[PDB]
Amino acid sequence: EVEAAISDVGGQQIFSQALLNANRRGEAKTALAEVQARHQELLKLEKSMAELTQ
Amino acid sequence: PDFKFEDLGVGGLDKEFTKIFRRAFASRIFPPSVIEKLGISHVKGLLLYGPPGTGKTLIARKIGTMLNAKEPKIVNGPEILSKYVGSSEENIRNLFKDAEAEYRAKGEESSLHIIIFDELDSVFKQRGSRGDGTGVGDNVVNQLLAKMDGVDQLNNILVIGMTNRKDLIDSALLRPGRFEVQVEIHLPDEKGRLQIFDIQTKKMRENNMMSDDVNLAELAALTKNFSGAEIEGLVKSASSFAINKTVNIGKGATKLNTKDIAKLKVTREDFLNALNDVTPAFGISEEDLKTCVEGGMMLYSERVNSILKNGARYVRQVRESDKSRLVSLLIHGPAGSGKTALAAEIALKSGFPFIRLISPNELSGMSESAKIAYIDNTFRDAYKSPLNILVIDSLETLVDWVPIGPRFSNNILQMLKVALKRKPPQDRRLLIMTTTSAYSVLQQMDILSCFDNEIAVPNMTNLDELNNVMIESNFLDDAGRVKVINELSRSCPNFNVGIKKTLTNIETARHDEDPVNELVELMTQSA
Amino acid sequence: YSGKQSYLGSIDIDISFRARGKAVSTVFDQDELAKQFVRCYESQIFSPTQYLIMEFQGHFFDLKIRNVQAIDLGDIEPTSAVATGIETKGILTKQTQINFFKGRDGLVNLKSSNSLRPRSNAVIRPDFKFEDLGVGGLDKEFTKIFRRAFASRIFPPSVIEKLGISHVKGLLLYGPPGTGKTLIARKIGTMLNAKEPKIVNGPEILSKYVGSSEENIRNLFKDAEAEYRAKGEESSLHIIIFDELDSVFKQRGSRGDGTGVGDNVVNQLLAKMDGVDQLNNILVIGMTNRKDLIDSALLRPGRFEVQVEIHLPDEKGRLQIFDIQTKKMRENNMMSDDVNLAELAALTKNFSGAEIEGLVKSASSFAINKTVNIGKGATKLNTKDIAKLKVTREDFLNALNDVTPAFGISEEDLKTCVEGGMMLYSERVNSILKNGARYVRQVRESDKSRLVSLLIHGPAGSGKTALAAEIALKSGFPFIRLISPNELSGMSESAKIAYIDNTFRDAYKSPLNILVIDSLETLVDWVPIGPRFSNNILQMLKVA
Amino acid sequence: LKSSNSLRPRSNAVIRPDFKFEDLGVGGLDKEFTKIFRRAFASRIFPPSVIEKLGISHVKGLLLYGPPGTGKTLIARKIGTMLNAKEPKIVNGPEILSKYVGSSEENIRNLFKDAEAEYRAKGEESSLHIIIFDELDSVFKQRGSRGDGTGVGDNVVNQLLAKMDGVDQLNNILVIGMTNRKDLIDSALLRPGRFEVQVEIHLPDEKGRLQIFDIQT
């Protein structure tokens, strides 16, 4: 007559992935992309003070 | 204008080209003015699909030559997704910008833009799904649909999808107005097989690099079961067998006969070895039939001849008439007389497009429900080609008859009984050949009403027929073959063995003691 | 000075251009250059690293002789090693095989002009032998692998182009554990004068953030495509080896994870091995123990074309493995003269390729322990003791008791079945054993009689199984197996069916096989009260 | 120090021949001690010159199994902390499994890199590294047997298989495992090259019982 055939229900697991804040944007965001123009200024101090020391 | 369909390498698939051309691009041949006056919209969505290794990617790559203007964009499915929140959704709705702008500006003069997603099934799984991770996999598809259905009058876009498995995809892409036409691309025929050889073998042929000995038609005939992919694989195997005769890899160093390089040439036997290396997943491997009959037919008597002619009569019968769309026959006789082989002989001689056999060996080891399923699978499949030959072997064994109870499995018996009475769908004909060895049992279950005609196959009894088979086996010398029969005549004239046992005894005696004292002895004990 | 090696056989010259603003784009013919070199400069002595100013049609050059071959008159073949040492010199002749390669500056458009010569960086290193790999046994599969894969890269390219063919780009190895399927990958990686392999362990791709896993699997080809777009065919081979593939690349469509990562990586790899764009200079290796879970699509030709099976070695291979493992020991005179390797190979019936090494280790361990005596008798270490260490045969005999096979686990049952001994209290037994031997021989010699079955019957307690075991043991066949009720006890019915099916299936590997079935009656659950018994097992056996 | 011409034993020896079995404090089990010390540690006392002349790599695995409450953890702990080696990296049973999609298998990868780097830096004069798997039989089950709708049973096993004996060699670690049931561990973990020496620890003999009373009191 009868027996077993399909059984369980209460039993499962799940992993979990993750995205990230957008503002993050490219690494260049404050104190990163400005270092290009901040360097020309610093080269200006170096120079103007080279005039100073000479 | 500078085109014709012949000039490109896709072999075999001509009908599909006609269908796709007629469905996709015909409407945009004419000046626009007709079509609005014709009140018909253009098709926007296209699906190409087929099993692995059919050539689809070659079509997607090449079609950009025929299709004027500039270039369809290409993307891979998994490239779209992205790390930043919101970037992935942006990416899809970044593709449509150019055509949108140009169209929006110029109206209907817009050049037709094509976009092709290779490997569509990567991310467009059925959006009404669960698993409840981060919901990006939903947002993405929604985005496309928004840009694809409510296009806001963008009528210069054809999106082409390539896949290996249709089923995975959201049904919400498979509807009118979105991926209307779905083109199935299945394995090539024999003629297409020949064209595939033609196209693959072009260059090597012009340059006088293959020996004239080779003849493509027979190679095409042999390779019954191959996709194009395997065909170029076989080509390179053959070429490699050619190349490896000068350069002796491993042994010694690189010894190049600079002279023989100019004379390098492939040949037929190389191709045979190449065949021996590769193996399709085509999988049906109906060569099963020939291994069944590997012991062969020696035609030792007239009875076999009469039976064969009767089989020929039936195959002609089913081939010719249109009202006889189903014929079944039963073949019965003593065990070991040899029955399956004879049916196989009929089948192989028939030469219909379509054959398979069912035998307990392939059935072995499943559970009952799986048996039932398999049997159903095979019958339903058989109904497709116009003319079909199908063989059922050792019914009693398939039903698990054992005389103790007697016990046996009813369900399979019922399935077979019902199946044997099914007239196929319209304009198909079928020939079903069943063999057994326990006739009385079949009588008593009373399923004998489902067989149109029955054939008996008595085993052999006369010493002359023994003489025939043994001369065929080249058992001994002539005097030997005479003396043994003379001795057997008086030793035991009444005689009833079969055939299989005779071969077995012949071999045993051949090795051990091919004088009388062993073969005749075993034959007497058996008899 | 040289004695005999007085001629210049083959000379490879890095032809830098003199002045790099003058770079002439016109094709430079190696034949014209060789002829000019010989004509203008004849019967001179040249050494490696001699620099030269070559004025050809007003386009000067800085010729550097990278290497020189020195050959004596009478050498039909140039078997003399091309010597990079400055000491070697020769006298230029009209027969010097002058090869030009581009200079360090790479500015010269040199051409092969019917130069049936080794390709510029022919990877396989023209003089190379299988014995130098260090892999015992498996002397046939190397033929298949090297013939199918690397046979076409060596040959000059123009002719291959005439064939109108593309190189293979896949290679797979599979088998049971410990057979030596990792050694090959390593030495192929290391011995082939290619770039360094880019090793990846199996589940090393996957990554936390969504969309970082796939990114990683397409960073591996980046250098290849970068190079290919530039130098085209004259690329040197890139090789990347996947270890243990089936971890990630399962059949897509299952419910493996609940996230949907495996599909994506499968998709990316599939798209990239063949894809829309052509690479034609890449090779991927794989290893695994189960061939059945790989997604089918990978196996279509164009991707993982050639598939090679690695199985357990035979006796000859066993001898070879002992030859390779116990190599340094012998040549360092640390080995007793008494051990004979053939007997060792004979004893180790079902040993795999990874077990012999443990045997060596154990044998040595006994030797060293005799000296040190860890624990009680400490501090005996002294020069005299360690100055005469040698392993002895009985150490190996002792070592056999520690290492035990893994596949040869069912024959032990057979040898213990006759623990009671055997006695020949009657003539009859001799007749029976003789008849069995006759049949065994018969199956051995024949070709067409591929299946023979026998039965033994008699009263209970008559000592039947032992007789069969003795018949079986004396055959010497590679493959022997036994199925008895002891094995199947406690299982469930379906498991029994599966087990028997598997046993028959793996009995189809070796050319010659012997299989023994004990007490059929009990296998099928016969009890006469009903009688009752299980039909399914019966039918399975009857079919099989 | 420097190795003189005379073949004296290693400068920074591991075992220190002023060593004795009665120092451990484990009574009863005696022959098994002999076996373990013979097979595993012997190779590391003799001078490297000969042992490299002997072209054999040291064994890199140990397995202990037996009924509950017999002394397994005692053996592991004692061997841990009376040798001359760095501190062992203990891990309890299901410590490896982690949340995010790729954190568990990174966690297996974390265990070995220190020995790896130090081996690259110096070579054959490395100090030994010890890592202890407590209770191996939780996660390392046979592949393909559990449905494992959550696919951690295969990724973990594969990672460990690849990394204990892989394409790159490493011969200065020692991994030791404890369990109650060796019948369910994957079979590929029990071949020579990984967990070579396996030892059963059984119930004590009467004389062993006397020894245990002597130790405790």
Ligand SMILES: Nc1ncnc2c1ncn2[C@@H]1O[C@H](COP(=O)(O)OP(=O)(O)OP(=O)(O)O)[C@@H](O)[C@H]1O
């Ligand atoms: N004239 C012949 N008639 C029948 N079989 C022949 C003949 N000549 C050779 N044979 C071979 O003899 C063998 C006996 O046939 P087969 O092996 O099918 O036995 P069978 O009687 O069907 O066995 P079973 O009783 O198990 O169904 C086959 O290999 C068959 O090809």
Ligand SMILES: Nc1ncnc2c1ncn2[C@@H]1O[C@H](COP(=O)(O)OP(=O)(O)OP(=O)(O)O)[C@@H](O)[C@H]1O
């Ligand atoms: N010819 C040979 N065949 C087999 N093993 C060899 C051979 N020569 C040396 N060996 C030694 O035996 C070992 C074989 O194991 P290998 O490195 O192939 O792992 P494996 O067999 O791939 O095991 P798994 O498949 O579980 O990774 C090698 O580590 C090597 O040291």
Ligand SMILES: Nc1ncnc2c1ncn2[C@@H]1O[C@H](COP(=O)(O)OP(=O)(O)OP(=O)(O)O)[C@@H](O)[C@H]1O
């Ligand atoms: N011809 C023989 N001469 C001497 N000893 C024998 C002989 N045959 C069997 N034996 C010994 O007698 C024992 C045989 O017992 P075994 O259980 O094999 O007999 P069996 O009848 O097959 O078993 P069962 O009683 O279950 O049917 C073994 O210990 C074997 O060593």
Ligand SMILES: Nc1ncnc2c1ncn2[C@@H]1O[C@H](COP(=O)(O)OP(=O)(O)OP(=O)(O)O)[C@@H](O)[C@H]1O
């Ligand atoms: N042979 C022994 N010699 C000395 N002490 C022992 C011995 N066996 C057990 N003990 C004592 O038993 C205590 C617990 O032993 P241990 O923790 O090894 O048991 P176990 O085998 O780890 O049990 P489980 O397998 O349940 O963890 C130890 O602290 C030790 O003092």
Ligand SMILES: Nc1ncnc2c1ncn2[C@@H]1O[C@H](COP(=O)(O)OP(=O)(O)O)[C@@H](O)[C@H]1O
């Ligand atoms: N007529 C043809 N039919 C099928 N395949 C062909 C044909 N001509 C060439 N081929 C080769 O077969 C391969 C087809 O691969 P394809 O089936 O597109 O892979 P997938 O199905 O995974 O996209 C290509 O490499 C192609 O060059």
